[PDB]
């Protein structure tokens, strides 16, 4: 197939065994705030430097994915400060500021954005990828995001 390749890792629930090794509060259940044609999101109150965090060691190639995206909905207030995060070798490999890869923007309140992060461009990074994280960096308390559709793509 000449259409570039995709690895869903949330869609309405995790997918193709990523695993949710979050140390933030969310839920992945969260029914309030979901996408037209999607049943859930991942709901991610951003507070005390939690993140979510799906893995799946070693299971996105760069050789055969070069971005990873998400949609995130900033909820009541928008303009949440969140920084996202490769991990290779079951290690952080570098971040990104969620408004630097929204094109300097903060992210719009009570609506959907589609996110996207290439692995070599935006971190340098490239070979197997252990998972992704979003973070709170603020520490306090954060209005709720709503992460859907998480995917890696050619
Ligand atoms: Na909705």
């Given at each position: 197939g000449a259409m570039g390749e995709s690895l869903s890792i949330?869609?309405?629930?995790?997918?193709?065994?990523?695993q949710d090794w979050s140390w933030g509060e969310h839920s992945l259940t969260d029914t309030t705030n979901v996408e037209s044609g999607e049943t859930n999101s991942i709901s991610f109150t951003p507070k005390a430097y939690?993140?979510?965090?799906?893995?799946?060691f070693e299971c996105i190639?760069?050789?055969?994915?070069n971005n990873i995206e998400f949609?995130?909905?900033?909820?009541?207030?928008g303009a949440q400060l969140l920084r996202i995060t490769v991990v290779?070798?079951?290690?952080?490999?570098?971040?990104?500021?969620?408004?630097?890869?929204?094109?300097?923007?903060?992210?719009?309140?009570?609506?959907?954005?589609?996110?996207?992060?290439?692995?070599?461009?935006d971190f340098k990074v490239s070979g197997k990828v252990?998972?992704?994280?979003?973070?709170?960096?603020?520490?306090?308390t954060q209005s709720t995001v709503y992460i859907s559709?998480?995917?890696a793509t050619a």
């Open positions: 949330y869609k309405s629930g995790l997918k193709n065994d990523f939690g993140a979510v965090f799906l893995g799946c190639d760069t050789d055969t994915y949609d995130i909905n900033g909820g009541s207030s290779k070798n079951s290690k952080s490999v570098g971040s990104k500021l969620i408004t630097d890869l929204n094109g300097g923007t903060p992210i719009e309140a009570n609506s959907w954005t589609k996110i996207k992060a290439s692995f070599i461009d252990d998972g992704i994280w979003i973070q709170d960096i603020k520490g306090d559709n998480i995917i």
